C-alpha cells in the first residue's frame, strides 16, 4: 500500500533528521543533507507491505505559499515541535494546526515531540534555565494533542532513535485504521 | 484435475498484470511529484538568492537578475505541472485502487466458489439425497460468479480505456505546456 | 586605511555566506534534477512496455513514452551544465575566496598584536615594536591586494558561469519544444 505522510512544523525542530534517521538508521550528524529533498521507505506494519513516502517541508514564512503545494493527496500529517523548544510548541496550535486544517480538513494528524534525548539533558535543562525557560512535559504535549484533535501524541529522538520507529508505525496505523 | 475456464482465466491473469504495471506507473507518478516539489523549492530559493546578489552586485547585476527571473518563473510553471501530475496520480489511483480492485473482489469469490465446487466433487469421488442437492448449490454459485466475473471484466476494460485515454492525454498536455509557457517567457 | 579595510572585510565575509548558499542550493539542483531523470527514464520504460502490450491505448501510451525518453535524453546534458556551474563556483569559494580569508585572518591578528604592544608601551620592546609594525603593515598591503584580486576574479568567473548556466537552461527548454512539436506527427 502507498501512504503519503508529510512532516510540518517550525524549522530547527528536527523534521529533516527525523526522516533521515528513520529511513537510513543513522542520525544525519556531521554533514547535514541536500536541501528540499524528500524520502521514502519500505516497511512491514502488522504483516502488511507499505510504501511510505516522506515529504519534508520548509518551516520558514517565505515558504508559506509553497509548502502547502505538498498537501494534496496526503494520508497523514506529522506536526512537530522540539521538546526543548517552547517556541515551536506554541506554534503548533498557533500556525501549523490551522494551516494543515485549512488545506486538509479530515486528515489524520499526529503530534510529535522531537529531541527527546534533550528534555532530560543536564546542560540543556540549564542553558534553558538561563533563559528562564523549561522543557515541554508529556502532559503538555498530550494536552496539545487533544486541543488540535490529533489521533496520537508521540515523543522521540532522531539521535537515540528512542520512540522513532513508533512514530511511523502509528502513523501508518492511523491510515490503515 | 480442475475446473478450467481457460478463456476467462486468461482475462483474469491479464487483469492482474495490467494491475501491477499500473501500480508501477503509479509509483513513478507519485515520485515524479516529489521531485517537482523539490525543484520548485530549490528554484524558489535560488531565485531569491540570485535576486539578492543582483541587488548587491553591480558588476554582475544583469547576469544575476537574468537568472533570478527565469528561476522565479520556472518555479511557478512548476506548480502547474505538479498540480496536473497530482491529478494524474490521483485519478489512476482510483482506477487501480477502487474500480479495478472492486472487480478483483468478485474474481476472488469466483475461484473460491470454483474451488469448493471442485472440492466437494472430489470428496464424492474418493468416497464413492441432499448430496446431489449441495452438489448443485456449489455448481450454481460457481456458475453465478463465473458470470459476474465475465460481466465486470468487460465493464472494466471498458472504463480502463476511457480513463487512461483521458489521463494520458492530459498528462502529456501538461508536461508539454510545461515548456510552451516556459520558452515563450524564458526566451521572451 | 583600517576601518575602511574593516568594512571591506565585513563585506567579504557576507559575500562568502551568500555564495556558500548558492553553492548548496546548486548542489541541490544537481540532486533533484538527477532524480527527475531517473524517474523519467523509469516512467519511460513503463509507458513503453505498456504501449507494446496494450493495443487499446498503444498510441497514447506510445507518444507519452517517447516524450519521457526525449526529456530524459536532453535532461542529462542539462545536468552536465549544472554540475559544471556548481563545480566552477566551488573553486571560486573553496579556494580563491578562501585563500583571501586566510590572509585576512592573519592580518587581523597582526593588527591586534600591534595595537596591543603599541599600547603596552605608550604607558625587547622597541626592537619588537618595529618588527610588529613591520608584520602588520606588510599584511595590510597584502590584504589590499587579495581583496582587489578576489573582486576582479569573482567577476571574470561569475559572468561566464552565470551566463553558461542560463544558456544551458534555455537550451534545455528550447531543445524540447522542437522535438516535442516534431512528435506531433
Ligand atoms: N539531541 C538531538 N538533536 C537533534 C535531534 N533532531 C535534530 N536535532 C538537531 O536539531 C537541529 C535541526 O535539525 P534539522 O532536522 O535540520 O531541523 P529541521 O530540518 O528544521 O526540522 C540540528 O542541529 C540537529 O542536530 C534529536 O533528536 N536529538
Ligand atoms: Mg529541514
Curated annotation (Swiss-Prot), chain A:
GO terms for molecular function: enzyme binding; G protein activity; GTP binding; GTP-dependent protein binding; GTPase activity; protein kinase binding; protein-containing complex binding; Rho GDP-dissociation inhibitor binding. It comes from the Eukaryota. One of its GO terms (cellular component) is cytoplasmic ribonucleoprotein granule. Isoform B is predominantly identified in skin and epithelial tissues from the intestinal tract. Its expression is elevated in colorectal tumors at various stages of neoplastic progression, as compared to their respective adjacent tissues. It catalyses: GTP + H2O = GDP + phosphate + H(+). It is found in: Cell membrane; Melanosome; Cytoplasm; Cell projection, Lamellipodium. GTP binds at residues 11-17, 30-31, 33-34, 58-59, 115, 117-118, 157-159. Glycans are attached at residues 31, 34. It is an enzyme of class 3 (hydrolase). The modification (Microbial infection) O-AMP-threonine is found at residue 34. There is a cross-link at residues 146, 165 (Glycyl lysine isopeptide (Lys-Gly) (interchain with G-Cter in ubiquitin)). Changing residue 36 to A: Strongly reduced interaction with PLCB2. Changing residue 156 to Y: In MRD48; decreased substrate adhesion-dependent cell spreading; weak dominant-negative effect. GTP-bound active form is ubiquitinated at Lys-146 by HACE1, leading to its degradation by the proteasome. Phosphorylated by AKT at Ser-70. Its EC number is 3.6.5.2. GO terms for biological process: actin cytoskeleton organization; actin filament organization; actin filament polymerization; anatomical structure arrangement; anatomical structure morphogenesis; angiotensin-activated signaling pathway involved in heart process; auditory receptor cell morphogenesis; cell adhesion. Keywords: Cell membrane, Cell projection, Cytoplasm, Disease variant, Glycoprotein, GTP-binding, Hydrolase, Intellectual disability, Isopeptide bond, Lipoprotein, Membrane, Methylation, Nucleotide-binding, Nucleus, Palmitate, Phosphoprotein, Prenylation, Synapse, Ubl conjugation. The effector region mediates interaction with DEF6. Plasma membrane-associated small GTPase which cycles between active GTP-bound and inactive GDP-bound states. In its active state, binds to a variety of effector proteins to regulate cellular responses such as secretory processes, phagocytosis of apoptotic cells, epithelial cell polarization, neurons adhesion, migration and differentiation, and growth-factor induced formation of membrane ruffles. Rac1 p21/rho GDI heterodimer is the active component of the cytosolic factor sigma 1, which is involved in stimulation of the NADPH oxidase activity in macrophages. Belongs to the small GTPase superfamily. Rho family. It is linked to Intellectual developmental disorder, autosomal dominant 48: A disorder characterized by significantly below average general intellectual functioning associated with impairments in adaptive behavior and manifested during the developmental period. MRD48 patients manifest global developmental delay and moderate to severe intellectual disability. The gene is RAC1.
Curated annotation (Swiss-Prot), chain B:
Residues 3-188 form the AH domain. It is found in: Golgi apparatus; Golgi apparatus, trans-Golgi network membrane. The gene is ARFIP2. GO terms for molecular function: cadherin binding; GTP binding; GTP-dependent protein binding; identical protein binding; membrane curvature sensor activity; phosphatidylinositol-4-phosphate binding; phospholipid binding; protein domain specific binding. Forms homodimers or heterodimers with ARFIP1. Interacts with RAC1. Specifically binds to GTP-bound ARF1 and ARF6, but binds to RAC1.GTP and RAC1.GDP with similar affinities. Interacts with ARL1. Interacts (via N-terminus) with IKBKB and IKBKG; these interactions inhibit activation of NF-kappa-B. The lineage of its organism: Eukaryota, Metazoa, Chordata, Craniata, Vertebrata. Keywords: Autophagy, Golgi apparatus, Membrane, Phosphoprotein. GO terms for cellular component: cell cortex; cytoplasm; cytosol; Golgi apparatus; nucleolus; plasma membrane; ruffle; trans-Golgi network membrane. Plays a role in constitutive metalloproteinase (MMP) secretion from the trans Golgi network. May have important functions during vesicle biogenesis at certain cargo subdomains, which could be predominantly utilized by secreted MMPs, such as MMP7 and MMP2. Also involved in autophagy by regulating the starvation-dependent trafficking of ATG9A vesicles which deliver the phosphatidylinositol 4-kinase beta (PI4KB) to the autophagosome initiation site. Involved in phagophore growth during mitophagy by regulating ATG9A trafficking to mitochondria. This is Arfaptin-2. Its main location: Golgi. It comes from the Eukaryota. GO terms for biological process: actin cytoskeleton organization; intracellular protein transport; lamellipodium assembly; mitophagy; protein localization to phagophore assembly site; regulation of Arp2/3 complex-mediated actin nucleation; ruffle organization; small GTPase-mediated signal transduction. It comes from Homo sapiens.
Amino acid at each position: 500500500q502507498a501512504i503519503k505522510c508529510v512532516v510540518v512544523g517550525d524549522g530547527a525542530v528536527g523534521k529533516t533528521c527525523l526522516l533521515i534517521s528513520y529511513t537510513t538508521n543513522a542520525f544525519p550528524g556531521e554533514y547535514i543533507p541536500t536541501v528540499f529533498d524528500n524520502y521514502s521507505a519500505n516497511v512491514m506494519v502488522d504483516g502488511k507491505p507499505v510504501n511510505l513516502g516522506l515529504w519534508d517541508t520548509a518551516g520558514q514564512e517565505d515558504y508559506d505559499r509553497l509548502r502547502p503545494l505538498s498537501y494534496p493527496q496526503t494520508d497523514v500529517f506529522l506536526i512537530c515541535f522540539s521538546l526543548v523548544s517552547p517556541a515551536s510548541f506554541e506554534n503548533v496550535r498557533a500556525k501549523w494546526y490551522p494551516e494543515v486544517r485549512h488545506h486538509c480538513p479530515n486528515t489524520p494528524i499526529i503530534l510529535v515531540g522531537t529531541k527527546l534525548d534533550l528534555r532530560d539533558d543536564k546542560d540543556t535543562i540549564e542553558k534553558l534555565k538561563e533563559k528562564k525557560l523549561t522543557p515541554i512535559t508529556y502532559p503538555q504535549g498530550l494536552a496539545m494533542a487533544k486541543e488540535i484533535g490529533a489521533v496520537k501524541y508521540l515523543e522521540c529522538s532522531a539521535l537515540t532513535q528512542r520512540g522513532l520507529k513508533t512514530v511511523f508505525d502509528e502513523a501508518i496505523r492511523a491510515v490503515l485504521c | 484435475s480442475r475446473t478450467v475456464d481457460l478463456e476467462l482465466e486468461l482475462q483474469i491473469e491479464l487483469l492482474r498484470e495490467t494491475k501491477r504495471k499500473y501500480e508501477s506507473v503509479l509509483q513513478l507518478g507519485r515520485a515524479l511529484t516529489a521531485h517537482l516539489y523539490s525543484l520548485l523549492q530549490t528554484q524558489h530559493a535560488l531565485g531569491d538568492a540570485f535576486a539578492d546578489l543582483s541587488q548587491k552586485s553591480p558588476e554582475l547585476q544583469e547576469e544575476f537578475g537574468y537568472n533570478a527571473e527565469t528561476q522565479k518563473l520556472l518555479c511557478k510553471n512548476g506548480e502547474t505541472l505538479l498540480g496536473a501530475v497530482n491529478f494524474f496520480v490521483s485519478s489512476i489511483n482510483t482506477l487501480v485502487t477502487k474500480t479495478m480492485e472492486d472487480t478483483l473482489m468478485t474474481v476472488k469469490q469466483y475461484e473460491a466458489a470454483r474451488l469448493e465446487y471442485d472440492a466437494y466433487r472430489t470428496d464424492l469421488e474418493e468416497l464413492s439425497e441432499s448430496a446431489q442437492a449441495t452438489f448443485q448449490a456449489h455448481r450454481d454459485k460457481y456458475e453465478k460468479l463465473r458470470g459476474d466475473v465475465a460481466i465486470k471484466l468487460k465493464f472494466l476494460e471498458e472504463n480502463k480505456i476511457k480513463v487512461m485515454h483521458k489521463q494520458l492525454l492530459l498528462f502529456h498536455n501538461a508536461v508539454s505546456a510545461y515548456f510552451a509557457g516556459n520558452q515563450k517567457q524564458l526566451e521572451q
